[PDB]
């Protein structure tokens, strides 16, 4: 009955919580409430440890009570909001934050939380506004500061950049040492100059967040199989992803499940998300030996059960710390061997992950200390892409001569050859080899369709489509879900690129550019006097910010050209218009690397120390283009400048990429799968021999 008794129990539970014994903190809070049920703060505290435990349904009930007892409890509103957000009720979470701010206009956390909703929604300027308000109200606020830092990064606001980075590092350093959870997200940690040890520790601490959520399930260790007898001589591999659908991950690996050899492997795909109806999902479902929809099994215990019950030997985490992940599944440890693969470009930092599948160029042995996992090397690159299957219409090109350039007016199509054979005057320039249509009436009709902005025309009974209009012609083709069934014209004029200039492209999201990268590029642009730099409005608000810094570096406006973000197929195809692609050294083009190389566009890169900054080098090594890999800033600029100034060297390198992209192992998904299969069996033979995981560096 007694408020003082209950107050004491609350203090004793707050003590158990600090000592990390969550278990017992709850039992005490619950007892404080049984003594004095109208105890605002006990309800609030019980609620926020229930939230930690992932018991969201019940956490929310206690927050509601806390608010009922104490209506000015702005802190409780803000946290209730967080709970609603995690429950997918973004609408109602927003109402919590707004309602808190109204009760206490001075309450920083609610502002920061409101900013988070904005950030997630993609409205970045409104996210920035709120983060700044939070920081005005409470100037020492690591969560808000680091989130703001990432917003600013996203739009290329580099105001006080150097001072900002030093502060991030300092904030993280302090949080690690005081054992609180870092405010920098592991998926962002590659963007700031933290130590490698810090990056690993940030990941480690995100891994721990699962532990509390799985401990309340009280599950015993699972008993893993120790031979392949039950599974019929076949090794059972389970791919776990929230991205079996229209998502980069599927655009890279959709072909792999079907290519596993069924004599030795049984493939299980565990989808973490509902069927989005796209062909990517269709294909994996149809080709995996087993497809399991875990989105229907939202309890992590029952899902982990299902994995174990299927008898998986190697469970593959294709998500790391990206949206949709459910690492609780991996923490429950239902498979004897669990490997990170392809999806997340960094270490999990977690004890429940055994291997990271990588390669010698991406993660050389010198830097094995960056990863908590043991390195398991693929023989060439760990990276793969479905471009050979998705976009076969780009395996060959043809050009129109409008005066012999390989990238001014381009034609691709499955039936390109049959069309060209209907034409009278086609020259065949040697290298395969590239056809050149001369300035005819036919050439004139193609270029008039482009100029007048028309959808499509017919020539000799072949359909000729305007490259800018694919989604109107055949939307599934535009997305990469189908191969286009028409001939597609792609021209520089379409995107406002100068007909007679060296074009340097970078199609990544703008967040990957930092002030050094922009400096590097300005340097190249000054030295190659005709060049332009081709960038995307990704996102658009970044554009006026780049243009601004570009001018302080002394480049006129008309030297950097911005295009809108394109549908997948148009995006890949229009790389054919660039001369060279300059890769961001801070965080490489990954999927975007494969995309630009498929078009046969050479890419200059400067491999850093982090995984994310080494991928492009790795892709190029596998292609067999070591001359595009720079050791420093100076060498990067030099390679780029030579490529723009020496037109015979350009022609030569471009031709090398165009050929290598078929003949090397890079885009060869069958060979990749087989290599992955070798590496799986190695991992297994080792575990069956009774060993703990160790480096698989061959």
């Amino acid at each position: 009955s007694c408020p003082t008794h209950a107050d004491s129990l609350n203090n004793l539970a707050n003590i158990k919580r600090e000592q990390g014994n969550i278990e017992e903190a709850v039992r005490l809070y619950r007892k404080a409430l049984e003594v004095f049920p109208e105890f605002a703060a006990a309800h609030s505290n019980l609620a926020s440890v229930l939230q930690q435990q992932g018991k969201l349904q019940e956490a929310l009930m206690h927050y509601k009570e806390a608010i009922r007892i104490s209506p000015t409890f702005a802190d409780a509103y803000s946290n209730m909001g967080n709970t609603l957000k995690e429950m997918q009720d973004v609408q109602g979470a927003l109402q919590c934050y707004t309602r808190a701010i109204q009760i206490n206009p001075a309450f920083a956390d609610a502002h920061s939380n409101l900013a988070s909703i904005h950030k997630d929604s993609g409205n970045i300027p409104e996210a920035i506004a709120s983060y700044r308000t939070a920081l005005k109200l409470k100037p020492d606020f690591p969560d808000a500061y680091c989130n703001l830092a990432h917003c600013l990064q996203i739009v290329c606001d580099w105001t006080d950049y150097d001072e900002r980075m030093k502060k991030l590092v300092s904030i993280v350093a302090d949080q690690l040492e005081k054992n609180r959870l870092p405010s920098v997200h592991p998926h962002h940690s590659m963007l700031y100059p933290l130590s490698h040890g810090f990056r690993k520790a940030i990941a480690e601490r995100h891994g721990n967040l699962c532990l509390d959520k799985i401990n309340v399930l009280h599950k015993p260790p699972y008993e893993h199989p120790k031979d392949l007898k039950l599974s019929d001589g076949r090794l059972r591999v389970g791919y776990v992803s929230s991205d079996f659908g229209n998502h980069p991950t599927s655009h890279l690996m959709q072909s792999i499940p079907g290519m596993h050899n069924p004599d030795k492997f049984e493939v299980f795909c565990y989808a973490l998300s509902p069927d989005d109806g796209t062909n990517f999902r269709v294909k994996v479902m149809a080709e995996a030996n087993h497809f399991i929809d875990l989105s229907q099994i939202p309890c992590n215990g029952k899902a982990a059960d299902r994995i174990h019950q299927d008898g998986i030997h190697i469970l593959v985490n294709m998500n790391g710390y990206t949206k949709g992940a459910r690492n609780e599944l991996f923490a429950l440890r239902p498979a004897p061997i669990q490997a990170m693969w392809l999806g997340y470009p960094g270490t999990s930092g977690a004890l429940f992950m055994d291997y990271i599948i990588t390669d010698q160029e991406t993660s050389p042995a010198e830097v094995a200390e960056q990863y908590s996992e043991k390195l398991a090397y693929m023989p060439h690159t760990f990276f793969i892409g479905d471009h050979a299957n998705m976009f076969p219409h780009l395996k060959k090109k043809a050009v129109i001569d409008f005066k012999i350039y390989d990238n001014r007016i381009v034609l691709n199509g499955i039936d390109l050859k049959a069309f060209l054979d209907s034409l009278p005057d086609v020259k065949i320039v040697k290298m395969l080899n590239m056809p050149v249509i001369p300035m005819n009436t036919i050439a004139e009709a193609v270029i008039e369709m482009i100029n007048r902005g028309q959808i499509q025309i017919t020539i000799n009974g072949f359909s000729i489509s305007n490259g800018l209009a694919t989604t109107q012609i055949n939307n599934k083709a535009a997305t990469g879900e189908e191969v286009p069934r028409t001939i597609i014209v792609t021209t520089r004029s379409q995107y406002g690129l100068p007909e007679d200039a060296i074009v340097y492209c970078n199609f990544n999201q703008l967040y990957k550019i930092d002030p050094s990268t922009l400096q590097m590029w300005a340097n190249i642009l000054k030295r190659v006097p005709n060049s332009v730099l081709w960038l995307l409005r990704f996102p658009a608000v970044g554009e006026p910010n780049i243009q601004q810094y570009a001018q302080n570096m002394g480049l006129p406006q008309n030297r950097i050209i911005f295009s809108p973000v394109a549908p997948k197929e148009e995006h890949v195809r229009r790389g054919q218009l660039a001369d060279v692609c300059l890769d961001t050294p801070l965080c490489n083009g990954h999927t975007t690397g494969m995309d630009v190389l498929w078009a046969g566009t050479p890419m200059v890169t400067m491999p850093g120390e982090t995984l994310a900054s080494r991928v492009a080098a790795s892709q190029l090594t596998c292609l067999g283009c070591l001359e595009l890999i720079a050791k420093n800033r100076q060498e990067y600029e030099d390679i780029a400048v030579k490529l723009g100034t020496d037109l015979e060297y350009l022609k030569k390198v471009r031709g090398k990429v165009w050929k290598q992209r078929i003949s090397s192992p890079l885009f060869n998904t069958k060979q990749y799968t087989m290599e992955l299969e070798r590496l799986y069996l190695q991992m297994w033979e080792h575990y069956a021999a009774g060993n703990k995981p160790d480096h698989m560096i061959k």
Binding site: D243, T322, K568
Partner: peptide
């Protein structure tokens, strides 16, 4: 949309 990978 054009889907990218996020945190």
């Amino acid at each position: 949309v054009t889907p990218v990978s996020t945190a």
